[PDB]
Scaffold this active site. Structure first.
Site, PDB file in Angstrom:
ATOM      1  N   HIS A  22       0.807  -1.202   0.000  1.00 21.51           N
ATOM      2  CA  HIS A  22       0.000   0.000   0.000  1.00 21.51           C
ATOM      3  C   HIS A  22       0.888   1.321   0.000  1.00 21.51           C
ATOM      4  O   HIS A  22       0.404   2.379  -0.289  1.00 21.51           O
ATOM      5  CB  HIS A  22      -0.953  -0.011   1.236  1.00 21.51           C
ATOM      6  CG  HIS A  22      -2.281   0.660   1.016  1.00 21.51           C
ATOM      7  ND1 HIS A  22      -2.911   0.682  -0.211  1.00 21.51           N
ATOM      8  CD2 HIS A  22      -3.144   1.245   1.902  1.00 21.51           C
ATOM      9  CE1 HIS A  22      -4.116   1.246  -0.063  1.00 21.51           C
ATOM     10  NE2 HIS A  22      -4.289   1.549   1.208  1.00 21.51           N
ATOM     11  N   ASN A  70      -6.337   6.694   4.011  1.00 20.17           N
ATOM     12  CA  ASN A  70      -7.761   7.040   3.750  1.00 20.17           C
ATOM     13  C   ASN A  70      -8.102   8.464   4.004  1.00 20.17           C
ATOM     14  O   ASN A  70      -9.216   8.908   3.701  1.00 20.17           O
ATOM     15  CB  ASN A  70      -8.657   6.120   4.574  1.00 20.17           C
ATOM     16  CG  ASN A  70      -8.496   4.634   4.175  1.00 20.17           C
ATOM     17  OD1 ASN A  70      -7.838   4.314   3.236  1.00 20.17           O
ATOM     18  ND2 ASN A  70      -9.040   3.706   5.016  1.00 20.17           N
ATOM     19  N   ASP A  95      -0.358   2.485  -5.311  1.00 15.97           N
ATOM     20  CA  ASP A  95      -0.454   1.034  -5.578  1.00 15.97           C
ATOM     21  C   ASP A  95      -1.753   0.794  -6.361  1.00 15.97           C
ATOM     22  O   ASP A  95      -2.796   1.463  -6.168  1.00 15.97           O
ATOM     23  CB  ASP A  95      -0.531   0.282  -4.269  1.00 15.97           C
ATOM     24  CG  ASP A  95      -1.649   0.801  -3.354  1.00 15.97           C
ATOM     25  OD1 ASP A  95      -1.669   2.061  -3.061  1.00 15.97           O
ATOM     26  OD2 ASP A  95      -2.449  -0.023  -2.871  1.00 15.97           O
ATOM     27  N   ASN A 116      -8.645   3.651  -1.805  1.00 16.80           N
ATOM     28  CA  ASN A 116      -9.163   4.473  -0.682  1.00 16.80           C
ATOM     29  C   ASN A 116      -8.385   5.753  -0.408  1.00 16.80           C
ATOM     30  O   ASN A 116      -8.938   6.724   0.226  1.00 16.80           O
ATOM     31  CB  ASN A 116      -9.279   3.595   0.595  1.00 16.80           C
ATOM     32  CG  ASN A 116     -10.441   2.567   0.413  1.00 16.80           C
ATOM     33  OD1 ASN A 116     -11.558   2.959  -0.059  1.00 16.80           O
ATOM     34  ND2 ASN A 116     -10.202   1.293   0.735  1.00 16.80           N
TER      35      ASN A 116
END
Length: 193
Positions: A22, A70, A95, A116
């Site tokens: 991530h 997020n 990513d 997100n």
């Protein structure tokens, strides 16, 4: 067609997330920063780590949100607004689950695609910024998406991703000098050696 003047890398803060899939965006921007000797410094005013310097003859800012993934918009949005940087002059590296390790694409516009980090950014600056989609693979099922992105890749997949990041790095000159269609052709043509 706008030069890219702000490059953002998405990811999570802390050493426990630094090697996770991530943070592919952080890898790209940190490696770019040290390639050109740009120093990334704490920038609490914009909830992130940022730098500025010369890349291939152009003055470029670099940003890593330290908001956690997020909430990335809480850094990208006020930063780009304060420096009056239009979305068209922004590249955001992140990513990409829908592409395998070793695959890398440059994209302009569109929505978040379920990402997100991008979900927190598109609402406030609109969609017309550029994205460096760094393939991280899909684990096979919705239930294990979270453990995959929040996990560390094995060596073989990591080499593929690193190869793909290296290639994009070599094309940043075209991006900062406003050559986006050329950069797009050249990044998107990459296949592992």
């Amino acid at each position: 067609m706008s030069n890219i003047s702000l490059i953002v890398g998405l990811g999570n803060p802390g050493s426990e997330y630094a090697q996770t899939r991530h943070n592919a965006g952080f890898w790209f921007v940190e490696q770019l920063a040290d390639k050109y000797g740009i120093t990334l410094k704490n920038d609490p005013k914009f909830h992130g780590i940022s730098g500025r310097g010369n890349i291939e003859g152009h003055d470029v800012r670099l940003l890593l949100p330290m908001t956690y993934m997020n909430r990335s918009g809480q850094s990208v949005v006020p930063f780009s607004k304060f420096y009056q940087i239009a979305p068209e002059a922004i590249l955001i590296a992140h990513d990409e689950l829908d592409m395998n390790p070793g695959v890398i694409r440059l994209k302009t516009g569109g929505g978040h695609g379920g990402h997100n980090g991008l979900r927190d950014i598109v609402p406030h600056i609109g969609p017309n910024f550029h994205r460096l989609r760094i393939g991280i693979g899909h684990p096979g099922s919705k239930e294990r998406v979270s453990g995959h992105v929040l996990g560390k890749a094995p060596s073989n997949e990591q080499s593929l991703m690193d190869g793909a990041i290296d290639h994009a790095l070599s094309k940043v000159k075209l991006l900062v000098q406003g050559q986006v269609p050329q950069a797009m052709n050249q990044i998107n043509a990459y296949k592992p050696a």
